[PDB]
């Protein structure tokens, strides 16, 4: 499986609109988002989120952007 | 108009899940707001003008930026 670093969580609180945003090693049609448990941000909850029909995740930018713009390498 | 993140988001979501503290911005269709806890009181937001990708719009029904037919800008 995946888990969450917790070093993210601790070091950010993931308060940043970029923290705690991954790629899917499953897929390039989406990422995984790092949701802190609680308020005491020690440990992360996976949420695995879909891009856009036809878009692609750009980990330079955080986000689900044209495919021409992809960092994911996967088939 | 001037945005101020509502309170009662801030306070019962801490902003933690990926959709919470997600909004429409109004100075453009091509991008968002995403306000951030501003303090531990967990009442007000830093608020982070975000854009779309080219082209595209803001979805405030799936509170992401969508091809521009599922706009809900205006």
């Given at each position: 499986?995946?888990?969450?670093?917790?070093?993210?969580?601790?070091?950010?609180?993931?308060?940043?609109?970029?923290?705690?945003?991954?790629?899917?090693p499953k897929?390039?049609?989406?990422?995984?988002?790092?949701?802190?448990?609680?308020?005491?941000?020690?440990?992360?909850?996976?949420?695995?989120?879909?891009?856009?029909?036809?878009?692609?995740?750009?980990?330079?930018?955080?986000?689900?952007?044209?495919?021409?713009?992809?960092?994911?390498?996967?088939?």
């Amino acid at each position: 499986a995946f888990v969450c670093p917790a070093a993210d969580i601790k070091t950010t609180k993931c308060l940043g609109p970029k923290d705690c945003l991954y790629p899917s090693p499953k897929t390039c049609n989406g990422y995984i988002q790092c949701s802190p448990a609680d308020d005491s941000y020690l440990t992360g909850i996976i949420h695995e989120m879909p891009c856009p029909s036809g878009l692609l995740w750009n980990d330079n930018k955080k986000w689900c952007d044209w495919p021409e713009n992809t960092t994911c390498g996967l088939v």
